[PDB]
Symmetry: C3
Subunit: 330 residues, 3 copies
């Protein structure tokens, strides 16, 4: 029958167009992919002044709120902190959340099994006028974290300027690319701010813009802390010029339930010697966690992939025709 032959030729044409227009065009079968090597260097340029009761004005420059000062990919930008000044080792009362004692016999000398704050001397001393806590041996100025300021201390960090410099290189093709594309120039970086539509190539990112693009409010996030994920994808075709190679920035919001362990926080201390006595300043820093992950691939024409793909296509076409014949006659 002529109709059977027409259907067979239609199936043959369909599979013959499919194999090429998919593997070669859509999937880039003739190209070869290699993993890149990336190093992320970040620089923060902004200032936030925090004034606390009983203390003088505090200046927080880049070195302050950026704790990974060595330009690590994963960095934390300080937005709120609790400061305990002039901590010195000695005999003093512990925190009330650790334990509450009504008499000296209640306290037991030794180390706490869980959440240890200090070596208990064995006496019950008044933490304040109302309650009494067991005396411990440690930094005497207590780190009270029960009161967290509702307005963020470093609330100016919302609309700061964040510079991200990423250099990627493909070892297979020996091609090195950087996020500073040829479209970006020196005068451009002076005033540009990153935008998904307006300024996609501008390497200067606003912290508030980055947080809002991830889906999180900066005000609520700055109080308790947060995690923001930044991904840079390098998808380019090496058959074209290297000018077309441009990085794509995607912001992902890493958050969780506020009822259980809200925000991100950590503690660091600055050790100094004053009046011949070793003292330190303890800060419970509530800051946003920024993680930068770079992944990408580059494709360039090669004979071996093209040949293998041609062979696979022939095999698919041959199998399809034989299978069609089995369907037609059985």
């Amino acid at each position: 029958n002529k109709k059977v032959g027409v259907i067979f030729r239609l199936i043959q044409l369909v599979v013959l167009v499919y194999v090429i227009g998919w593997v070669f065009v859509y999937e880039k079968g003739y190209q070869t992919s290699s993993g890149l090597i990336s190093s992320v260097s970040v620089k923060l340029k902004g200032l936030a002044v925090t004034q606390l009761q009983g203390l003088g004005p505090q200046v927080w420059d880049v070195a302050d709120y950026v704790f990974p000062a060595h330009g690590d990919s994963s960095f934390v930008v300080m937005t709120n902190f609790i400061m305990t000044p002039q901590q010195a080792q000695g005999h003093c009362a512990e925190n009330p959340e650790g334990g509450i004692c009504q008499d000296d016999s209640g306290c037991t000398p030794g180390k706490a099994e869980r959440k240890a704050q200090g070596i208990r001397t064995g006496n019950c001393v008044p933490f304040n006028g109302t309650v009494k806590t067991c005396e411990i041996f440690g930094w005497c100025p207590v780190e009270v974290d029960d009161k967290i300021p509702s307005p963020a201390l470093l609330h100016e960090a919302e609309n700061f300027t964040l510079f991200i410099k990423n250099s990627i290189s493909f070892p297979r093709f020996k091609v090195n690319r950087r996020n500073l594309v040829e479209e970006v120039n020196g005068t451009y970086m002076k005033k540009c701010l990153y935008h998904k539509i307006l300024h996609p190539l501008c390497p200067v990112f606003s912290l508030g813009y980055v947080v809002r693009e991830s889906g999180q409010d900066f005000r609520s996030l700055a109080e308790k802390g947060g995690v923001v994920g930044i991904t840079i994808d390098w998808e380019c075709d090496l058959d074209w010029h290297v000018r077309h190679c441009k990085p794509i920035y995607q912001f992902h919001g890493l958050y969780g339930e506020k009822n259980l362990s809200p925000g991100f926080n950590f503690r660091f201390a600055r050790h100094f010697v004053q009046n011949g006595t070793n003292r330190r300043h303890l800060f419970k820093v509530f800051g946003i966690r920024f993680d930068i992950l770079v992944d990408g691939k580059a494709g360039k024409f090669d004979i071996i992939p093209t040949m293998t793909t041609i062979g696979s296509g022939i095999g698919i076409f041959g199998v399809a025709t034989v299978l069609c014949d089995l369907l037609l006659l059985h």
Copy 2:
């Protein structure tokens, strides 16, 4: 032929059952796989007090033995240290491991090519009563690390509490998950220790338990340093509810030969100004290296993968039937 037909029916049934069950359900062919974006937050809550000879009791807290303040995937917990207090830059004797001089003519003005300890002035000064070393310019108190304390100074760091906060999100499926699963509540985190048999979901990990689960004894690993690797896997089946997916924690121990480079150690210093003179304290810290690696895969039903797998199965089935016929023919 009847037997040929029976063999063909059997082969067809076998290959059909295979292509319908294995690749479809066992391999999750109908589902699509994607990656996740992860960020690890670690917190150490523990207290260790060391009483070095000739010094006062030293208290170590979270800011002390956790050298990464913000908290990275790779962090070191201090277990043993060698302290060289009050280092000042001047002309003084070097360490005997560098070289031993019997006369002043032996020393040469310059710097050593390998393992340089300072700028040699060309003079031979007695390091102690017995031997003499060439005078160098630098920190006069040399870190004498020939003697390592047999009992770990921070031996209490064995059964401390370690909390790991991991937030993973899949971009294509827009699903965000955290290690704090629905089963874990606020009261649960108050009193729980990670036990793979009893408490697999408890996010609080005991350091000694983590070290023992890696195949290493904590005492020798602490007195000399070591490396412990922790992996978190997120295998989720998005066809079910999100509560079904739970993180799986695996502890792998990274160890080497004790004869060559035993354990892990590093050098850090704290700079201070006392009596108008710049001084520092040098610590040779022997600590366990903890690395957190998070990798996961999620699969959800989709029409395109299902269709491709069905088509592939038909092709495999078709090839198998043709092959069976050829085998029967010959």
Copy 3:
């Protein structure tokens, strides 16, 4: 026909040799692959003395130029720095690049929108004899980074010694390997330096050698900063003995445009209390960025992969015969 039979036999033997030698032996189809986990430990043994105008001789040791104290995969080695000493918070003039004022009416009280240096009081004060800058609130000794010393302050860091400790393990096969191979003994590390041909397994890497093998001159990188990528690959066959497993060390140079953001730079501060007043030292460090990435794969014989490869090979063989027959029919 005889020639048709010869062509058929030739195609048969060709596809047989292919399926038996390429996908089985050359590609190790019978083996199975599993990813490894790695933790990198780095240690620098070098000393550089920098003499600056006004300040005394400054001695820099391992703890100094290596800012990551514990030691991560990404670390910075200080090669050049700009030191601003005795920074104290107060009302004082800003940098000329931030803004130049000719009258007090020009300055406006507030903070700069971009690249803020301090809180402008609103009075134009002379920065020096010629120009005047608006008075700001912050660290009064301003970092004047316009003048970069042409000779690197730390140029001796070229031919220093760098030791990399990498411990890898495969969880599937429970085999742990370290970069210290059995050929590397204790006496070997004392007198070996890494080379591509001479000492491929020596774990001591010269910084200048690493920089030069990446295609970069050490002086240009020491002047304005640099980024160097190190990759350690673990390609071994677990069918052989573990002694054959040897890591491969190669260095990748992440080049950057000289006119736009040359090199890598960062800023850190050391806080100290002197004479009861809080002061700090600000350093703008132009240090080379060293990134270490480990990617390895191990293969061991298994029955399931061997069977699948045999089956796939038979399928390819069958398809080829059918295709050949179709061509003969045509």
